[PDB]
């Protein structure tokens, strides 16, 4: 086992929420009695030597394509799972400027959709998308515009 | 297999049911569905009883969201209760509300991202609409 880093972007420049679509066999194999679920951009601390939120950035850039500093994060909780990894999320606010193995392909989530596609249960979601997405709305969303 | 997990709030001690499993984690009252043709609101009932001592009615949970652990499927629920629907290895555990947000920030603490998000679902869908 190890730790593990997951963040939740929201891009300003257009109103949505940055998360990823991935194929996991698990959901697959439960809807064959699709596959494809989407959850908060994530990543294990595989690497002996890296800050949390430098794995964070990291990821933020293989799996989204957003280049982040360290320092623009920030951090939302820290949890238990599972046999068990600690894990931490991690925030962000980031622009167009930002903006540029596995089977990801990055998602937009426009904030106004948002809590509606959290609770429709027909699109495969990970706690976390769900908790991003709540999270998000009460802490972030009315200091915004 | 599918899950449940089920989050209670007694009103009578305005704290919230959670459960304990220094390797101590702090979970919601959760269960597999586990037998054949067993509701899901159903299997909560089960759980929320062997594991918390609480009588639940099927009719008494919400559902405040479906998700995928594990990468198994779940199904999370809530419902308000009083003692008088209490009983008289795992522990129960009551969380006073007037503390709860920060219980749930302090990473010093292990908690369940199903805790967390209770707290903080229930502290902004809830509480507010509450006395």
Known sequence: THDSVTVLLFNSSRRSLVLVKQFRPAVYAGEVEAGVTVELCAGLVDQPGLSLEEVACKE???????????????????????????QTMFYTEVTDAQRSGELIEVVHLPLEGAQAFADDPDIPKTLGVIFGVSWFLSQVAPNLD
Do not use: F, I, K
């Open 60 to 86: 933020a850039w293989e799996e989204c394509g957003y280049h982040l500093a360290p320092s623009d994060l920030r951090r939302v909780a820290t949890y238990w799972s599972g046999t068990g990894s600690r």
